[PDB]
Amino acid sequence: SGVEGAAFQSRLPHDRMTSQEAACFPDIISGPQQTQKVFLFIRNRTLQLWLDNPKIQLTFEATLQQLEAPYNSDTVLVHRVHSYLERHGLINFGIYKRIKPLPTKKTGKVIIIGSGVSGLAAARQLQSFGMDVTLLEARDRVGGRVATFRKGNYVADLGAMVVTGLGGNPMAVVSKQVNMELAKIKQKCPLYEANGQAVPKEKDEMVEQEFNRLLEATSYLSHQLDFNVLNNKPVSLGQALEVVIQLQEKHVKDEQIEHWKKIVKTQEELKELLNKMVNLKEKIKELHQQYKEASEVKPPRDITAEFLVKSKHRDLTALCKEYDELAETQGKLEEKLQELEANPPSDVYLSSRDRQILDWHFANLEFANATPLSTLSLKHWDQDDDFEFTGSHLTVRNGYSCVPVALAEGLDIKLNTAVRQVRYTASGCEVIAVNTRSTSQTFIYKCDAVLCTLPLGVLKQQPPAVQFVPPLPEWKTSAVQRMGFGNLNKVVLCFDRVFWDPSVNLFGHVGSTTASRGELFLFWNLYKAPILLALVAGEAAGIMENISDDVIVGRCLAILKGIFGSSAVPQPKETVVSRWRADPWARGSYSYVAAGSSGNDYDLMAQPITPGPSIPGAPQPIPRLFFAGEHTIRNYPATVHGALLSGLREAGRIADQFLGA
């Protein structure tokens, strides 16, 4: 549909009212069905209008004009719906031509810590609502973990690189507002073992299929068998995979045992039969002698001597019948055994090469979660699965930095300004920052509210890079400790000529050992210029940060030579190596659901802080300290769209507080 498609593109159920809507429209959701379908149509239609042209402000007047009866009947209902959508940033978010210029008179003052996507998204919304906004950024640039490398025509993202589908993605709206060159990623990914040989198609499919079966098993092991605690410690995904692999190895051995145990049972049937046949051959041999002696007594005979010949004849034919019946039984047990000897079960679960190729699929999973699998929560690592966008994954050819830079237009941003201390009281806040270039130059910003978009890595730093006065409550600090902050690094290789299959966007490299499965395990070809981009994932990420660029570029060239040949791989013209864990304004790449954490901690991170009263017995103060960022959005963590949505959320929560709902 068209109106239902707008609900979907806004991550809303088209035929039902959400929790947020129930709160802002209690009268409607608590009342009769008819009014709800009116609400739901007005909502869905307003969204459709905004989404059809997100480059210009959709005003309330414009909305009511394009609404037809009986939906344009109630003007206050249409106004309430429009206001709700605008406030929560479902319409008139991003970069749009404003119809009614912003009033010179500004209500309230907000300091936003960090000019990453979360920070920038929030700032635009607050300014748009007529608040005085100032962003404090430690770096000499905006974007934060959206970081694009640029020398001449070379363009390569060291941070966010991929739009994970446009279906329900707010970056779909942003991509129409800003000129991003969005290019589909072709999913074809050939692997290349330690030596340089492509994995044989038949084997490749087998290992990949086993990886997916192994994952599916950890889920079964988690949800059905309830294997989520072991020694009063939360079970990791890594632990669960070890345990699932061990049970697959056990079953291989158990299978061999039962097969060989039914060969011995058949051999011990044969042994018991051959013994009977060997004894019966002796009794036949003896009885033949007796018959010869008896019949060599030439006639004429008395009847006893005749009977002796006849009786022995009868007895010898009887015994010869049995031995022939037993030699039939012998023949079929030899057929049964010749069959079993050449129908054996599997020799091994996974060969050495198979375990190496499987380690690449684990490295891929360690890349996706930006952490070793031993850190991931078995139960909750994939808790955001139900909210994944539909459509092909795309890359930004002109570099992802084009997005923050666009969002930064018309905003008060202090660069080279490192926040040191955040003070929050019943009367307001002061943020204490320094010049990053000369740390003695001290700045004091007085505001009604602080929006903190400091990465989880920074919030985790001990001793603290940023002091809170008063200190954050135990419920916040415990969430910060529990939650995982991952690491993932990129090696940018700029060449003079394309020496690789230009129709293949990415190709894998299988590591020699488990320990180094993450080390330069994947290569990206997404850019116009001749650039290959190598990931360092899993345990490799942390370790490869203490090794020089020259060595890392060295190991890259080696790996590429093996696959393409020494003659085809020149020296790179330009090389960059990301070191995200050592970056003091990141302290890692993005959040993961750590063993011992859950989705609930993301909600704890998003909850604002309310200071105590100044004078005791004074009424409950308003909330002063707010939180946005990738680590604050349970349903879209570790993403740009996550950061974006988290900013829009806080802008609404702050406006509701300081301008009234």
């Binding site: 990914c189 996706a368 979660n369 690592w381 699965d385 994947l522």
Partner: peptide, 9 residues
């Protein structure tokens, strides 16, 4: 998270 996985089925 899972979304970032390459070579997805």
């Amino acid at each position: 998270p899972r979304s970032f996985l390459v070579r997805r089925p």
